[PDB]
Amino acid sequence: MRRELAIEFSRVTESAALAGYKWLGRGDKNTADGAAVNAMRIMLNQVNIDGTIVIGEGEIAEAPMLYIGEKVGTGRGDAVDIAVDPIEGTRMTAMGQANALAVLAVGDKGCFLNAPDMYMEKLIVGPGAKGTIDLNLPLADNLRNVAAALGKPLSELTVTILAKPRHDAVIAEMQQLGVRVFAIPDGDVAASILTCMPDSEVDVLYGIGGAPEGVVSAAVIRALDGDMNGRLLARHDVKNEENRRIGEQELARCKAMGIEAGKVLRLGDMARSDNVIFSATGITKGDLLEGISRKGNIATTETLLIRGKSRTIRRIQSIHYL
């Protein structure tokens, strides 16, 4: 009867996407965010769940809505963990650029790792390479094992990774290795799912991104029967002295939370059961989803709707009579 809620959750990302779409090309990241946050909360508060925000906009001091620990839903139905990413791609919404989307994941109570807002090294693959990765092994070793599971030469293997200065050395190493490297400007949530889409060239995601985004990836990767490892990393091992100010408070938040940074998290350490509903609606067109189009009174959305308990991946094209 939680599968009965799947449609309800797709309405939540549809509303959030449409609200961020109103601010497309308007040069205001905060107002576009606020609109999508606003709309996602409103909509969640009408769904029959007793949700706790486990991944969200920030702590209450910084985020007055969808803060970590916030209760959402009507309070009927199951106690559920909630992960929200109201706009994945806020900069691009403000700039009228590709790859903005609205994201939500719902799991069993206690399903999502409560990671602090810090960096996480990620390594993600699809179903055909499940059980063949380990971040305790060298990258090159990992890529070779993945290429063999996928049954392709290493030179064909496609690794997507965030285009950031921290990734220069590893990009040079992968290229030197003969791997194809898709260095993306955006963010790593949508990109991780490509590892599981047969029609994407992307086989693997590797690299350092946000820890909360990582758990959202872990939940959908789990639902899609792929694989992932992560590793939490404090700021000064990634990007100093202002970086160890903000980086020692990340390990402080870790210790009293209570997990250890620097240790390898397996898929099951991040997403703990298979009972995940994942919904994502495109705002602008990207690799995963089409964008919103509006011709006067009618808007269209595409939503990817994934349920862990099952044998079906849905793409829902909705025509909205605004």
UniProtKB/Swiss-Prot annotation:
Effect on the protein upon substituting D85A: Great decrease in FBPase activity
Binding-site positions, substrate: E88, G89, T90, Y119, K164, P165, R166, D186, G187, D188, G210
EC number: 3.1.3.11
Pathway(s) per entry: Carbohydrate biosynthesis; gluconeogenesis
Cofactor(s) listed: Mn(2+)
Regulation acting on activity, per entry: Competitively inhibited by low concentrations of phosphate (IC50 3.0 mM) and is also sensitive to Li(+) (IC50 70 mM). Slightly activated by KCl.
Binding residue positions for Mn(2+) 1: D33, E57
The keyword Manganese is annotated on this UniProt entry: yes
Effect of loss of the gene: Cells lacking this gene grow normally on gluconeogenic substrates (succinate or glycerol).
Induction (record text): By glycerol and sn-glycerol-3-phosphate.
Residues binding Mn(2+) 2: D85, E88, E213
Entry's cofactor comment: Manganese. Mg(2+), Co(2+), Ni(2+), Ca(2+), Cu(2+) and Zn(2+) cannot support activity.
Effect of E88A: Strong decrease in FBPase activity
Effect of Y119A: Strong decrease in FBPase activity
Predominant location category: cytoplasm
Reactions the enzyme catalyzes: beta-D-fructose 1,6-bisphosphate + H2O = beta-D-fructose 6-phosphate + phosphate
Compartments, as annotated in UniProt: Cytoplasm
Record-level GO BP terms: fructose 1,6-bisphosphate metabolic process; gluconeogenesis; glycerol metabolic process
A molecular function (GO) term: manganese ion binding
pH dependency: Optimum pH is 7.5-8.
Record-stated family: Belongs to the FBPase class 2 family.
Function: Catalyzes the hydrolysis of fructose 1,6-bisphosphate to fructose 6-phosphate. Is likely to be involved in gluconeogenesis during growth on glycerol. Also displays a low activity toward glucose 1,6-bisphosphate, and no activity against ribulose 1,5-bisphosphate, fructose 2,6-bisphosphate, or fructose 1-phosphate.
Quaternary organization: Homodimer.
Record's protein name: Fructose-1,6-bisphosphatase 1 class 2
Protein species of origin: Escherichia coli (strain K12)
Gene assigned in the entry: glpX
